[PDB]
């Protein structure tokens, strides 16, 4: 019921866009697909809903984060920034799963954006393994 191959493509599109970012001319605050989240291969076989609920939660968090003062405030993002597209693809992937901070200095905001985008590469790397594995082993 999950629609694995669409998720597989959207998470692939996120891996590609996230690695094309470079705003700089550890990440304490975000979410992570942890060991207890059950997104390892065996955990997917046994309880795929539990894992995908925690991926959805993190995707929503990253959407909201990319669509906030950290990224929409000054210094303005450059027209060649991938943030806008990532926002759209994060939103698209979280809909497939279910239809229904803020420093002062601008140099500190650039650094913060970089840590968030670097964190997202790790997050979507795991999600892509989840959707690739489920497409291979959990699809009828």
């Amino acid at each position: 019921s999950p629609a694995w191959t669409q998720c597989q493509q959207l998470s692939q599109k996120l891996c590609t866009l996230a690695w094309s970012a470079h705003p700089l001319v550890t990440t304490n605050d975000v979410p992570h697909i942890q060991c207890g989240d059950g997104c390892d291969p065996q955990g997917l076989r046994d309880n795929s809903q539990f894992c995908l609920q925690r991926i959805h939660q993190g995707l929503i968090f990253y959407e909201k984060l990319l669509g906030s003062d950290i990224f929409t405030g000054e210094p303005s993002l450059l027209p060649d920034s991938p943030v806008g597209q990532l926002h759209a693809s994060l939103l698209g992937l979280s809909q497939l799963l279910q239809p229904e901070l803020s420093p002062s200095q601008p140099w500190q905001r650039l650094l913060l954006r970089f840590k968030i985008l670097r964190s997202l590469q790790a997050f979507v790397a795991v999600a892509a393994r989840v959707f690739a594995h489920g497409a291979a082993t959990l699809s009828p």
Partner: protein, 301 residues
């Protein structure tokens, strides 16, 4: 002053001429009270008397093994090491700077998979009186266990009189979770003592950033009569399993003495093979950009 190891103490010194140094108090671990004298290394010169000895530690002449005596009776020893801070920066004399990926890279670590096992390397020109101690953990606030072996000589290059040495150590995370997204990095800590000088080093990383897969295994060619070839390989034995989850992506290259490259997620590919060429394949994690593996080649024809 702080204790490195029983009866071994480290003294931190701002290293510059006409520097005041540190006033250090040594204490003789003995139940005797009277008749106590102090000496340093192999000098008979009595430097003080009583259960304690106060010294102004300014140079390596003030460092060494202090011994307290009760006449001919040796009592206890205190070894002082110096950690010199030069120009406001802790010395890095003992290890050679590898300058890769960036400057002041003294330890380099690698993993072949997501198992929690990894290896770290470093270089030195020193051949004698050299001791290394390795410790590791994931996180700082509440460290999680990582078990490390002993550093050992892995390689040596000698050109005439200039000798260069490579050391390595294998470590492993106690409770590894290969699929998890790491939030806290691994910390690798190396103490280096040479004669009386103490230096230490650290490397902070995530396993996913030090991944370098082994080369693809069992690379083979099947010809087809416009001289095309069916290239096929298998994942390396050491890569994480299942491959449906820990996927690799591949680059297949045709090169002779002009190049043809194809990039595929499959473990097979069709290329046009010419005389005296070579089919090479290398591998990378499919979803996270880390190091490419070494090429694996098979001659063309």
């Amino acid at each position: 002053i702080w204790e490195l190891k029983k009866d071994v103490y480290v003294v931190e010194l701002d290293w510059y001429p006409d520097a005041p140094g540190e006033m250090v108090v040594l204490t003789c671990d003995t139940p005797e009270e009277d008749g106590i004298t102090w000496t340093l290394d192999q000098s008979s010169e009595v430097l003080g008397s009583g259960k304690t000895l106060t010294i102004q530690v300014k140079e390596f002449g003030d460092a060494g093994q202090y011994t307290c005596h009760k006449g001919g009776e040796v009592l206890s020893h205190s070894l002082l090491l110096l950690h010199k801070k030069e120009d406001g920066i802790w010395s890095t004399d003992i290890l050679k700077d590898q300058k890769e990926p960036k400057n002041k890279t003294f330890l380099r670590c690698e993993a072949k998979n997501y198992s929690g096992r990894f290896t770290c390397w470093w270089l030195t020109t020193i051949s004698t009186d050299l001791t290394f101690s390795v410790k590791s953990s994931r996180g700082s606030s509440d460290p999680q266990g990582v078990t490390c072996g002993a550093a050992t000589l892995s390689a040596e290059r000698v050109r005439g009189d200039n000798k260069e040495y490579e050391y390595s150590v294998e470590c492993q995370e106690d409770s590894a979770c290969p699929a998890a997204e790491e939030s806290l990095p691994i910390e690798v800590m190396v103490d280096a003592v040479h004669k009386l000088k103490y230096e230490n080093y650290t490397s902070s990383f995530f396993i996913r950033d030090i991944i370098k897969p082994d080369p693809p295994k069992n690379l083979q060619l099947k010809p087809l009569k416009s001289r095309q070839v069916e290239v096929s390989w298998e994942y390396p034995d050491t890569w994480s399993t299942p491959h449906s989850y820990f996927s690799l992506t591949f680059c297949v290259q045709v090169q002779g003495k002009k190049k043809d490259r194809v990039f595929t997620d499959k473990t097979s590919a069709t290329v046009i093979c010419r005389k005296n060429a070579s089919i090479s394949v290398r591998a990378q994690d499919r979803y996270y950009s880390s190091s490419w593996s070494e090429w694996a080649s098979v001659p063309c024809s």
